[PDB]
Structure formats: structure tokens, C-alpha cells
Amino acid sequence: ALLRILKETELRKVKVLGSGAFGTVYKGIWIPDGENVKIPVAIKVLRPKANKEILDEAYVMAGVGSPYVSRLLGICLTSTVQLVTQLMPYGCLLDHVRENRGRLGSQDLLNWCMQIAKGMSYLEDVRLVHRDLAARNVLVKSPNHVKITDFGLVPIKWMALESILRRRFTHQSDVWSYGVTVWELMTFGAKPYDGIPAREIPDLLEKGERLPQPPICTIDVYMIMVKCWMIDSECRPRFRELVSEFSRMARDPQRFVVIQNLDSTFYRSLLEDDDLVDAEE
Ligand SMILES: CC(C)(O)CC(=O)NCCn1ccc2ncnc(Nc3ccc(Oc4cccc(C(F)(F)F)c4)c(Cl)c3)c21
Numbered sequence: 026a027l028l029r030i031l032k033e034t035e036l037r038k039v040k041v042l043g044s045g046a047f048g049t050v051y052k053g054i055w056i057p058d059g060e061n062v063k064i065p066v067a068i069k070v071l072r073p074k075a076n077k078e079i080l081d082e083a084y085v086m087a088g089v090g091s092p093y094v095s096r097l098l099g100i101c102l103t104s105t106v107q108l109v110t111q112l113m114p115y116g117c118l119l120d121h122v123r124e125n126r127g128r129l130g131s132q133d134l135l136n137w138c139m140q141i142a143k144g145m146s147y148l149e150d151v152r153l154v155h156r157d158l159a160a161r162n163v164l165v166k167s168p169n170h171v172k173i174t175d176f177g178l179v180p181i182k183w184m185a186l187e188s189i190l191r192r193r194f195t196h197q198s199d200v201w202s203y204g205v206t207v208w209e210l211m212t213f214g215a216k217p218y219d220g221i222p223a224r225e226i227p228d229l230l231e232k233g234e235r236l237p238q239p240p241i242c243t244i245d246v247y248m249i250m251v252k253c254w255m256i257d258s259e260c261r262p263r264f265r266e267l268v269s270e271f272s273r274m275a276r277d278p279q280r281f282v283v284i285q286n287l288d289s290t291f292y293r294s295l296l297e298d299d300d301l302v303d304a305e306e
Contacts, residue, residue, distance in 0.1 A: 065300050
């Protein structure tokens with residue numbers, strides 16, 4: 026068990042991305058000492074017994090990160106906590122699927138759902154519950170390869186039922202979140218239970234009422250969303266299961282997803298004043 030402290034002198038040319046609820050997110054170049062490398066990084070800077078929680082959390086970030094999980098590099102401590110991670114060139118996935126509504130295909134779409142599921146399968150192994158899984162928290166490394174990030178806390182509409190009412194979070198409750206994430210992607214980035222306000226959700230989730238089958242979706246794919254949305258959380262599928270099935274579908278996707286017959290704003294924005302080799306040193 027150990028931890029890597031970055032001092033600001035290393036962290037160079039630093040510009041803002043966005044002010045999220047958990048805090049602010051910037052970008053910049055990282056020049057570790059002794060190492061001649063320059064590294065494009067993402068820096069998060071957040072905002073009594075919440076702080077002590079901030080240890081055991083990111084200490085779990087030691088170890089062998091999955092190809093599909095965003096891996097922490099280390100921390101800059103100023104008067105605030107800056108978490109530093111390698112920059113994903115294509116920004117966030119939701120934006121990506123939103124911006125790509127027209128061009129996208131089913132080959133791409135299942136390929137991801139496999140990946141996210143495989144990433145979640147890994148965190149499942151390393152005994153850390155995510156709590157906020159949503160399309161908003163999947164980043165795009167390349168048009169074919171994606172990473173899950175964040176895991177560290179008011180989004181009810183991605184939450185499980187027990188998570189709402191009892192405030193208990195297992196890996197099974199992360200599967201619900203996942204289901205909603207898949208729907209998100211099959212809807213080309215739709216907002217779940219739009220117009221239906223947050224108060225009523227638990228109330229009428231009990232009515233067994235759920236998100237409607239996405240247009241481009243087959244029953245074979247839709248069954249799995251509903252599988253995740255079982256109140257009886259034990260009757261939800263294990264992440265390993267999700268990966269296997271999503272692998273089946275990827276070997277004939279037009280049989281499972283029906284579309285017709287690829288750019289990023291964010292990536293385009295990077296092409297100025299500063300993106301290669303992964304750098305897991
Ligand atoms: C527009 C907005 C409001 O800023 C939302 C927003 O986050 N937009 C996307 C920002 N973004 C774009 C490329 C990209 N590549 C990588 N990380 C990004 N963002 C990011 C998100 C969460 C972070 O914080 C955590 C917390 C917990 C765990 C980890 C870990 F390292 F394990 F993955 C990182 C950090 Cl450091 C960065 C990236």
C-alpha cells in the first residue's frame with residue numbers, strides 16, 4: 026500500500042474543462058521529475074469525516090488497473106486535493122454518443138457495453154463499489170476503447186431502489202445503474218424518465234413500471250435491461266454474465282441492434298497548444 030504525491034511544479038499549463046457538482050475539472054501537461062516524459066492529464070479538484078474517507082478510497086487505486094478502468098496517477102496537494110489522471114482524448118461518452126447520433130453503428134455500440142461491463146467486472150474483483158455508474162462517467166480513449174471513471178461520493182434516476190430508500194450500495198445495485206447506462210446508449214443518449222420528476226420514481230418503480238424499449242433495440246437486448254431492474258436484487262445478473270452475453274451479441278450485431286447504413290468536438294478542441302503513449306510507467 027502506497028501513494029504518489031505530485032508537486033505543482035510538475036503540473037504544467039493548466040486550463041479548465043468544467044465545474045461539476047463534485048468539483049472542478051482541468052487539463053494540463055505532466056512532467057514527472059527525472060523522467061523526460063510529458064503527459065496529458067486530467068486534474069480533478071473537489072470541494073469532518075468525509076476527508077478520512079478520501080484515503081481508503083484512492084489507496085485502492087494502487088494495484089493493477091483494468092484496460093477499461095480509468096487509472097489514477099497520483100495527487101497534487103495544495104490547499105486543495107487535486108487528483109491526477111491521464112487525459113482521455115475523446116472526452117466523455119455521453120457527449121460522444123450525442124454528437125455521433127447520425128454516424129454510429131451497432132458494431133460500435135455493443136462493443137462498448139461489453140467493455141463497460143468488463144470494467145465493472147474488474148472493480149467487482151477489486152472489491153470497490155462504484156455508486157455513480159452512468160454514461161456521464163464513461164470516457165473515450167479511442168473510437169473503439171472506453172474507460173469507466175469517478176467512483177467516489179443526487180442522481181436517483183440511475184440508482185437502484187434500495188439505494189434510494191435504504192441508501193445501501195452493493196455490486197448488484199451497480200448493475201441497475203449499468204442497465205440504465207445501456208439504455209442511455211441505445212437511445213443515442215436520451216435522458217431517462219424525462220419529465221417524470223424524481224419524487225415519484227421509487228413510488229412507481231414499485232408498480233413494476235420501467236424505461237421503454239429503445240427504438241433500435243431487439244427484445245434480446247431489451248430483456249437484459251429489465252434483468253438489471255429487478256427489485257429482487259439477487260435476481261439481477263452477475264457482471265461476468267453480462268460480459269459473456271454482450272460478447273455473443275458482438276459476433277452478429279445487426280441481428281441484435283438495428284440502425285441504418287465519426288467525430289468529437291472535444292478532441293477537435295485539444296488540437297491546439299498540447300496525446301499518445303498510455304504511460305502506466
Ligand atoms: C465537463 C466536466 C463537468 O468537467 C465533466 C468531466 O469530467 N468531463 C470529462 C473530463 N475528461 C475528459 C477527458 C478525460 N480523461 C480523463 N478523465 C477525465 N475526467 C475526470 C473525471 C473524474 C476524475 O476524477 C476521478 C475520480 C475518481 C477516480 C478517478 C480515476 F482516476 F480512478 F479514474 C478519477 C478525473 Cl481526475 C478526471 C476526462
